[PDB]
Amino acid sequence: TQPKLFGKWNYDEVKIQDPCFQNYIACTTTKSQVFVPHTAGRYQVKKFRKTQCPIVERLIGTLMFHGRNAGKKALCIKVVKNAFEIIHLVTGRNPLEVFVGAVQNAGPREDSTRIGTAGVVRKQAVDVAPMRRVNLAIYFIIKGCRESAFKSMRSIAETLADEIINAEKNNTQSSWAIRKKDEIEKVAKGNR
Amino acid sequence: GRVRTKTVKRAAKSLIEHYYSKLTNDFHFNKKILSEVAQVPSKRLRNKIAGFATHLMKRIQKGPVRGISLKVQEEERERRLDYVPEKSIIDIEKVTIDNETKEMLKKLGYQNIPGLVSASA
């Protein structure tokens, strides 16, 4: 039988419509269908292993990233589970089919390469890769959570939850994530 | 950075040089040979020599092997198969001369002897 996520979230409840992300994500594999986002896997070894990482394992990783406070996946797996419960209680959708969308949206499609010649700082038009795109997307999403999450009674599992939602919506006023997603392209569309 | 020390190469070269006949296309079998065949201090180094020596074996399964000499074994059996003629490609009987050639010959005075000239339109 099908191993649901956290015990209650069918993986086959999602599909990657765009071809871009098809190989640069995890929902799709048999091996990916995990109960727990903890694999102590050995990704990050070859030069593209990162791929085969169950999308959420990646989220958890990028999540335990602030110095002193972090470095302990144990907990982070939690902050992500609660956040999924919370995302569900609002749109009652398969929260992976949410987080997933968000991942696809929050990734800038264009960036500018700083190429300076003798003091002058010029830039060019650059198209952002897929692996890079997803990486940026998650990094971004989480990046923001902490932003508000600080001296706030709002919790990461809440901040994050509230983020993954709007990040899927493209709501440019409710996602520190998509703000840059747009600006980076905009500024980049200027330098180009 | 998998390159071979000169020593590693020399060994494989000289091993193949002496035992070609015996050497196989299998590393393991060859490694065993190389060890029974000479003084290889490092067990590891032994392999390197065999692993590479084995490589050369497959490059001789081609023939072009710079640096190696397979005398009796091959090089010589080479001569044994290439010395059977029947009539010197040169006919001392009838020989041919062209314009120029005959021109030089008529000066030399040897213009015409037992060799016939042929004209062409």
């Binding site: 871009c20 190429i115 060019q124 952002v128 890769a129 890079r132 | -």
Partner: protein, 67 residues
């Protein structure tokens, strides 16, 4: 926000550019409504293999160099 995102995939990974030694130059093939098939030589940044798919937000480009 009405953009003309034509999806194109990687035909051949040319070389690396921008002494920032991180940018990659790639030959593309398209698959979208507008045209399709048209081949371009665009400049990427980031992890990219042969055959991926990239959303170009401007088909009128194709800068290039190979020296």
């Amino acid at each position: 926000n009405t953009e003309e995102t034509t999806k194109a995939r990687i035909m051949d990974v040319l070389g690396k550019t921008g002494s920032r030694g991180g940018i990659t130059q790639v030959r593309v093939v398209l698959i979208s409504g507008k045209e399709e098939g048209r081949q371009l030589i665009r400049n990427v940044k980031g992890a990219c293999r042969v055959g991926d798919v990239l959303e170009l937000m401007e088909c009128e480009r194709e800068a290039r160099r190979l020296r």
